[PDB]
C-alpha cells in the first residue's frame, strides 16, 4: 500500500460526493465537476445522529413521570431545564418555536461534533475494506454544507420574525434609518445594516465549521506524520482539549440563535 503521508492526509480530506446523473461512488484519485454530487457521508451520519436524538427523547417524553425520575429520565430533564433556562433568560415572547429550535440545535450540533473524538481511521477503514466505499469522513459539522444549511435556516427565521413581529413598515425604518438617523445618511445605512444582518448567520456557520475542520485535520496530521509509539503524547492532550470545543461550539450556536431570533422581534 503506497501511502506516502502527504497522500494519506490527502485521501482523508475527501468526502463521498456522488453525482445524481451517474449515481456513482467517486474516489480521491479523480474528482468530477458538477454541483449535484451529494456528500453521502454527511447526510447519512447527520440524519442517523438526528434520529438518535429524537429516538432517545421520545422514549422518555412518551413515559416521563413526575415521581422521583429514573436515572436516565433525569439526564434528559437536566438538558431540558438547561435549554429552557437559557431561552427564558434571553426571550420573553410567546413563540412555541424558539424553545424546541434551541433544543434541537444544541443536542444535534453536540452529537455532530462528538464524532470528531473517535479514532480517525476506525469508521473510514471499515467503509473501504468491509463495504468498499471509495472514501469516508464521519464528522458532519466539519463540512461547510451542513453548517451553512443550519445558519441559512436560522436566517429565514430571522427574517420571518422581523417581518411578523414589527412589519415591513418597521423593518424598512430600521434598515434605512439606523444607525445615523438622518435621511441624508439613508444610502450609506442600507449597506451597513444589510450586511450586518447577514454577518450574524455567516459568523454562526463558519465559526462551527472553522473549529471542527481544524480539529479533525489536527487528528489527521498527528495520525499521518508521527510514528505510532509517539502519537499518544500529542493526540491525548488534544482530545482532552477538543471535548471543551465540541461543547462550547454547540452551546454558542444555541445561544446566538436565541439572541438573534430574540433581538429580531423585541
Amino acid at each position: 500500500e503506497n501511502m506516502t503521508p502527504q497522500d494519506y492526509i490527502g485521501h482523508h480530506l475527501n468526502n463521498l460526493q456522488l453525482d445524481l446523473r451517474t449515481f456513482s461512488l467517486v474516489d480521491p484519485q479523480n474528482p468530477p465537476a458538477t454541483f449535484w454530487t451529494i456528500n453521502i457521508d454527511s447526510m447519512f451520519f447527520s440524519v442517523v445522529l438526528g434520529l438518535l436524538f429524537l429516538v432517545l427523547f421520545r422514549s422518555v417524553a412518551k413515559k416521563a413521570t413526575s415521581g422521583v425520575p429514573g436515572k436516565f429520565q433525569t439526564a434528559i430533564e437536566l438538558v431540558i431545564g438547561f435549554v429552557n433556562g437559557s431561552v427564558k433568560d434571553m426571550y420573553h415572547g410567546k413563540s412555541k418555536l424558539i424553545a424546541p429550535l434551541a433544543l434541537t440545535i444544541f443536542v444535534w450540533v453536540f452529537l455532530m461534533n462528538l464524532m470528531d473524538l473517535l479514532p480517525i481511521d476506525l469508521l473510514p477503514y471499515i467503509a473501504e475494506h468491509v463495504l468498499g466505499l471509495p472514501a469516508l469522513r464521519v464528522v458532519p459539522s466539519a463540512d461547510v454544507n451542513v453548517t451553512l444549511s443550519m445558519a441559512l435556516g436560522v436566517f429565514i427565521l430571522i427574517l420571518f420574525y422581523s417581518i411578523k413581529m414589527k412589519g415591513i413598515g418597521g423593518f424598512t425604518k430600521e434598515l434605512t434609518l439606523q444607525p445615523f438617523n438622518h435621511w441624508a445618511f439613508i444610502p450609506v445605512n442600507l449597506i451597513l445594516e444589510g450586511v450586518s444582518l447577514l454577518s450574524k448567520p455567516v459568523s454562526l456557520g463558519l465559526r462551527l465549521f472553522g473549529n471542527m475542520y481544524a480539529g479533525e485535520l489536527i487528528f489527521i496530521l498527528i495520525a499521518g506524520l508521527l510514528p505510532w509509539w509517539s502519537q499518544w503524547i500529542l493526540n491525548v492532550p488534544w482530545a482532552i482539549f477538543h471535548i471543551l470545543i465540541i461543547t462550547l461550539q454547540a452551546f454558542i450556536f444555541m445561544v446566538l440563535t436565541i439572541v438573534y431570533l430574540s433581538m429580531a422581534s423585541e
Partner: peptide
C-alpha cells in the same frame, strides 16, 4: 464571557478555516 468570546472568535475563525 461566553456570549462575548463567541463574537470575538467568529471573525478570525473565518480566516482560520
Amino acid at each position: 464571557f461566553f456570549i462575548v468570546m463567541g463574537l470575538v472568535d467568529a471573525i478570525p475563525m473565518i480566516a482560520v478555516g
